[PDB]
C-alpha cells in the first residue's frame, strides 16, 4: 500500500494545466481574467480553491454535467461562426466584467439587445456540415425588474428556444431580484447544445437571448479535471492524486480515492 506523497503534482508525463485563478467553466465562457486560457488543451486540468469569477453574475443549471464533458474533451478550441443577428444591437457589455479599462463581457458570448425601439423575433440557423460534434454554449438573461426588461428587450416577456433535429430547449426568463452580487441583482443562465454531423442548430428568440459566437470542437479521450491545492513540480509520475503524485509500483494505495492515470487501487 502506497501511503505517502511528495505533496507535489509531477508535470510529466501527463499534460497538466494549472488553472490558477480560474475555474474551467470561466475559461470556457471567456471571463476576461481567464482569457489567457483561450484555445488551451490538457490531459489534466487542475482547479484551485482560490479561483474566483469576475464577470457578469451567472449560474449553470446542471453545472456538473457541462464541467464534466468539457473536462473530458480536454480542449477549449473555439471556432467563430458568422451568425447574422438582424435588427438587434450586438456586443453588449458590463462594468461587472471590465476587459482592460472599459466594460466588456464573456468573450465567447454575445449579449443582444434592442435596436431602436424594437427587438424582432430572431430566427437563425447554422448547419453542421462537418464530421465532428459541435458544442454550442448560449444563455438567457434574467432581469431584476420590469423596467429593465423593457428597456433592454422591448417585449414584456422574452423567450429563447434552441433546437436540433431531435432535441429542443425553451427557456422563459424569470424577472425578479436575486441576492446582490458585485452590484447586480440580475443573472445570466448558461445552457448548451450539441449538434451532430448532418444536423442543424436553430435559435429563435424574441428577447433575453445571450447568443453564441461559434462552437467548441468536441473531442473524446483521456482528459479529466481535478480539485487540488498541490504545487506543480518538474518530475515524472504516472499517477496523480489531489494530494500529489504517488508511485504506482504497489498494487494498492491509501492517499486519495480521487486519482488520474495509471494508479494503484484505493483501499
Amino acid at each position, epitope marked *: 500500500v502506497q501511503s505517502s506523497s511528495t505533496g507535489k503534482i509531477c508535470n510529466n508525463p501527463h499534460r497538466i494545466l494549472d488553472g490558477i485563478d480560474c475555474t474551467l467553466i470561466d475559461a470556457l465562457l471567456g471571463d476576461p481574467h481567464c482569457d489567457v486560457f483561450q484555445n488551451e488543451t490538457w490531459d489534466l486540468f487542475v482547479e484551485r480553491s482560490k479561483a474566483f469569477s469576475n464577470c*457578469y453574475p451567472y449560474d449553470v443549471p446542471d453545472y456538473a454535467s457541462l464541467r464534466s464533458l468539457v473536462a473530458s474533451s480536454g480542449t477549449l478550441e473555439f471556432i467563430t461562426e458568422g451568425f447574422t443577428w438582424t435588427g438587434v*444591437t*450586438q*456586443n*453588449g*457589455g*458590463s*462594468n*461587472a466584467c471590465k476587459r482592460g479599462p*472599459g*466594460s466588456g463581457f464573456f468573450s465567447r458570448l454575445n*449579449w443582444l*439587445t*434592442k435596436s*431602436g*425601439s424594437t427587438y424582432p423575433v430572431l430566427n437563425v440557423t447554422m448547419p453542421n456540415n462537418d464530421n465532428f460534434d459541435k458544442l454550442y454554449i448560449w444563455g438567457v*438573461h434574467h*432581469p*431584476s*425588474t420590469n*423596467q*429593465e426588461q*423593457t*428597456s*433592454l428587450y422591448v417585449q414584456a416577456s422574452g423567450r429563447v428556444t434552441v433546437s436540433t433535429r431531435r432535441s429542443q430547449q425553451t427557456i422563459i426568463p424569470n424577472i425578479g431580484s436575486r441576492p446582490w452580487v458585485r*452590484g*447586480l*441583482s*440580475s443573472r445570466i443562465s448558461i445552457y448548451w447544445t450539441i449538434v451532430k454531423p448532418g444536423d442543424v442548430l436553430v435559435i429563435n428568440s424574441n428577447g433575453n437571448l445571450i447568443a453564441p459566437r461559434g462552437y467548441f470542437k468536441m473531442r473524446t479521450g483521456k482528459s479529466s479535471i481535478m480539485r487540488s491545492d498541490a504545487p506543480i513540480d518538474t518530475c515524472i509520475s504516472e499517477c496523480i492524486t489531489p494530494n500529489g503524485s504517488i508511485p504506482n509500483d504497489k498494487p494498492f494505495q491509501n492517499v486519495n480515492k480521487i486519482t488520474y492515470g495509471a494508479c494503484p487501487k484505493y483501499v
Partner: antibody
Amino acid sequence: QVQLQESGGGLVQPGESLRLSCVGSGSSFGESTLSYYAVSWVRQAPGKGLEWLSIINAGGGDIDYADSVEGRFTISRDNSKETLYLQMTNLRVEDTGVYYCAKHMSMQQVVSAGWERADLVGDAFDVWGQGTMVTVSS
Amino acid sequence: DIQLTQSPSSLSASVGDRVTLTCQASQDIRKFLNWYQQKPGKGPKLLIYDASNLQRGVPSRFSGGGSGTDFTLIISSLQPEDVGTYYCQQYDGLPFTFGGGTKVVIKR
C-alpha cells in the same frame, strides 16, 4: 419624455470662468431618465447657426470636444442628480451666445442591468433645453 | 471636419406650395443625417432622423430623402406655422456638424 433645462448663464469678463448646468426631468421608454443617454452641448452665437461643442456618454466616458473649445471646456455629469455640467475657462468674446444641452436618442446604458452599449452612437437630438444666455464682455 | 452646405440660404413661398430644401455633405456620410426646425426665440426640434424617418408627432407634410452626400427635406404643402429656420446635421464622424441653415418665409 425627458425634459431638459439649462441654467448658469450670465455675464462674465474675458478670461474668467463659468459653470453651466442642465437638469433632466421626466422619462422616456422603460421609464428611462437622462442618465440612460449620451448628451451634447451645442451653442448658437447671436444671429448665427448651431455649433456642436462637446459630447459625453451616459456613463461619463467617450468624451470629445470641438477644436474651438478643446483644452478650455470640460464636460461632465452627475447621474445621481440627473445633471450635466459644462465648465468653461479662459472665456473669450466670441464664446458669447445661447448654450443648449441636447439628448441623443439611442439608449446607451441601463445601470440596473449592468448593461452598456459597446459603442457611442451619437444619433439625433430628440430633446433640447430652452437654452441659457452667456455674455462675455468687459 | 465634414462640412454641410444648405440651399437655398433663404426662401419665400406661398401657402400650399411644395418646398424643397437641400443639404450637401463634403464626404459620404451614408444616412447619418438629421433635420431640425427652429422657430425664433425657441430651441430646435427634430423633424427627420437618419435621412428619412419622420419623428413622432411631426406633421406628415414633412418628408426626408437622400443618401451619401445628397439629402433633401420636403414640405408638401407649406403652412404659415412653418416659418422658421431648418438645419441639417451630420453624425457620420466627429466633430458633429450642422448646415448653415435655411430660412423659410411666407408670402401672403
